[PDB]
């Protein structure tokens, strides 16, 4: 009952994960995080998720 968010991130400089996961914050804004509300970062990528159910 969820959805699937993930972030692309590649390698920028060393490892960072806030700086990932915040795109995926970031990526867009309007509702109450209503999209993410929570994600975990990843190498080379970042993988969110919406919480809601």
């Known amino acids: 009952?969820?959805?699937?968010?993930?972030?692309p991130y590649k390698?920028?400089?060393?490892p960072y994960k806030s700086e990932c996961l915040k795109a995926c914050a970031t990526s867009f804004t309007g509702g109450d995080?209503?999209?993410?509300?929570?994600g975990k970062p990843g190498f080379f990528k970042c993988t969110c998720y919406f919480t809601t159910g």
């Open 1 to 7: 009952e969820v959805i699937k968010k993930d972030t």
């Open 11 to 14: 390698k920028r400089k060393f």
């Open 33 to 38: 995080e209503s999209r993410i509300q929570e």
